[PDB]
């Protein structure tokens, strides 16, 4: 009787959990209204169809030590996000364009930081005329969970997630899968290159091109560091058209003609720089980001292919918003213009 109570306090290990305040229990229980439950699997399906893999299910239950309207999202036990959701009220978000003001609790949306107001339902039509995006309560939690899942797509993608990706893809594409793992490339390294792509916001939707590429390079090379760059080049048209959608002008961040030279000889064995230059490199990268942001341009640093993996992991530990692309990853049929530069004069 009591013997099974002990083993189920210890059975816990949820890869993504959300603890909820008591007034947000209704939208979480199937017997009251499951409006958040339908929201959570809606966003889980889109993520499977936008990112490539199905995320671990969110298991949610109560926590009375937190305030009534506050939800906490946390990943395998460590906290990633939080915020308020008032079930009786609506969130009126302003994307800067809408005109005017509205009464109620002044706040900012939990995902992007836009100015927002919590409003009563009678004023729902008010904010819509003004141009404010009126958003329900269950949605604020779902949209914030969706945004935080995408920010942590790589970490959510563990060894067990790669195998169910293998399984799902092994049966529509059987000829590309039976010989591949563990024949060509091992499952350990197979998982680490798709995680490498997710950590740089590169989607995994096209598994065919990813596996077709591996069949040709992985037989006599299984460093996940080099296979990632090889796979990235194969996905080069999708990478281009997601940060440069359409056929407009590719305005990138560039490196100094002397810095890139000095940077190559560091890895080339002919002399690494003073540490102060490395901190100086980080400094102008921040100014290049804010510059490209002051002209309304994507935060893309277009780089020599040999320098791409280094500067990517070196500059994104501190500036995660930066995107570091290779010259081989950008398409041919695109006209380039450097708008910001790191290391100038």
Author numbering: 348 to 692
Provide the authors' own sentences about this structure as they appear in the paper.
We found a new orthorhombic crystal that diffracted up to 2.8 Å resolution, with unit cell dimensions a = 71.7 Å, b = 96.2 Å, c = 114.1 Å and the asymmetric unit containing two FlhAC molecules (A and B). The residues from Val-349 to Val-357 in FlhAL of Mol-A form an α-helix, which interacts with the hydrophobic dimple of a neighboring Mol-A molecule related by a crystallographic symmetry. Trp-354 fits into the hydrophobic dimple, and Ala-351 hydrophobically contacts with Pro-442 on the periphery of the dimple. When Ala-351 and Ala-356 of FlhAC-ED in the crystal structure were replaced back to the original Glu-351 and Asp-356 residues, respectively, the side chain arm of Glu-351 can form a hydrophobic contact with Pro-442, suggesting that FlhAL can bind to the hydrophobic dimple of FlhAC even in the wild type without the flhAED mutation. Because the introduced Ala residues would increase the helical propensity of residues 349–357 of FlhAL as seen in the crystal, we suggest that the flhAED mutation allowed residues 349–357 of FlhAL to efficiently form an α-helix to stabilize the binding of FlhAL to the hydrophobic dimple of FlhAC. These suggest that FlhAC-ED adopts a more compact conformation than wild-type FlhAC. Unlike wild-type FlhAC, FlhAC-ED and FlhAC-EWD did not bind to immobilized GST-FlgN at protein concentrations less than 10 μM, indicating that FlhAL with either of these two mutations inhibits the binding of FlhAC to FlgN.
The flagellar protein export apparatus switches substrate specificity from hook-type to filament-type upon hook assembly completion, thereby initiating filament assembly at the hook tip. The C-terminal cytoplasmic domain of FlhA (FlhAC) serves as a docking platform for flagellar chaperones in complex with their cognate filament-type substrates. FlhAC (residues 328–692) consists of four domains, D1, D2, D3, and D4, and a flexible linker (FlhAL) (residues 328–361) connecting FlhAC with the N-terminal transmembrane domain of FlhA. Interactions of the flexible linker of FlhA (FlhAL) with its nearest FlhAC subunit in the FlhAC ring is required for the substrate specificity switching.
